[PDB]
């Protein structure tokens, strides 16, 4: 599924994100918008051969079991499908546990480089929330 903005918005705000570890939840709308074009079904292969899922590009390295990562963590003991659902609860969910990972939002290369430290409410302006 490719969200609307505001639509990816009300879905994190349900699932849990907005100020999620302190990141509200423009932060989180805009990551998936650079990650993903909010696009659930978003795939990326990584040079090291992992690959990055859904509408937050979660990467098969650490995080999900894709089968074809091979020494790699399932830390959201998820396969990577799951991820790619137009339900994103499985997305969210292993969201909360990477940022909660010392790194924050930095852990999503999308988001440092072009929401880290930007208007970031701008991405749930208009949103009925
Ligand atoms: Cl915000
Ligand atoms: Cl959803
Ligand atoms: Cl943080
Ligand atoms: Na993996």
Redesign the pocket.
Same mark, same amino acid.
């Given at each position: 599924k490719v969200f609307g903005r505001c639509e990816l918005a009300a879905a994190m705000k349900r699932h849990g994100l907005d100020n999620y570890? &302190?990141?509200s939840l423009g932060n989180w709308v805009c990551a998936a918008k650079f990650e993903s074009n909010f696009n659930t079904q978003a795939t990326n292969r990584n040079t090291d051969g992992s690959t990055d899922y859904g509408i937050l590009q979660i990467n098969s390295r650490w995080w999900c079991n894709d089968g074809r990562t091979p020494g790699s963590r399932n830390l959201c003991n998820i396969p990577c499908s799951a991820l790619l659902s137009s339900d994103i609860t499985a997305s969210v969910n292993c969201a909360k546990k990477i940022?909660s990972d010392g /790194? &924050?939002? /930095?852990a999503w290369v999308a988001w440092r480089n072009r929401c880290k430290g930007t208007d970031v409410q701008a991405w749930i302006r208009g949103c009925r929330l």
């Open positions: 570890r &302190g990141y940022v /790194n &924050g939002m /930095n």
